[PDB]
């Protein structure tokens, strides 16, 4: 059946889904706050992760300020970061919405489509397949771009 | 390709969807708020809707405090309201999460399903069915259960 799960993620920290993302399901993750004028990061200002059961970094995105990119990338539990993505002008990916933003994962199967607010921002291929157990949100108080708490939920079963 | 859409709803107002929603596809209101003492309805006191193009209602949500009930309805434009649903105690159906407010519709094409943050409500048996093109959230700014201002997220394209 279809259902909707609500997860409080505070900076720094994982959460295991009650209901796992799998192909034709949805993820998004809600700010509270934009900060575009945050510090450096170390070398990441934020990032979103959504792993396999194994721990695998099925996608991983990286907002970095400084650098002013966007990076995707996924990762074996204990191999290296794999062949990474970039998408530059973090800014302009969420102009329109000042003060908050969302970001939506799409589990299409193939590839992930995410999308910040309205724009589709990548279509990500998979390196690494499979369902998506868990979710993380990493970052510091001091330089995230979002919340200190990033509200995740998911809309399971879609595909029926 | 699936799409995210953003809407922010002032209470007493409508908006005109940019793409609309239809079978499996989903459906969104967000209240940065949770006013469960709120003054008398009249006697709602803040409904959310789903419109066709021709202006019927295929979803009707009424919340009535001191009713202390969550009517479902539909009716055709200029006719009369059909067989209405009920769910009693609306602060129940709450429960679990203060200061703020999720309500989800899913287009399950027969029937909506209507689900309070994480909590299915009500699987609510289409009585006109049709693409929803318009979305409302009506109340005053005094007796309202939820913020001034309720944002809309859609997710379409999901079942092609």
Known sequence: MQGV???????????????PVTTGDIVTFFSSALNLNAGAGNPNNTTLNLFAENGAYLLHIAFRLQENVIIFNSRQPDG???????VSDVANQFAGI????????????DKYQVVINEKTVIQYTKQISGLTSSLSYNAT???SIFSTVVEAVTYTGLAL
């Open 141 to 143: 108080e001091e330089t």
């Open 80 to 86: 290296p970061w794999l062949v990474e993505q970039r």
């Open 5 to 19: 799960n609500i997860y409080n993620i505070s900076a720094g920290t994982s959460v295991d889904l009650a209901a």
């Open 98 to 109: 000042d003060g908050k933003a969302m970001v939506t994962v799409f589990d299409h199967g």
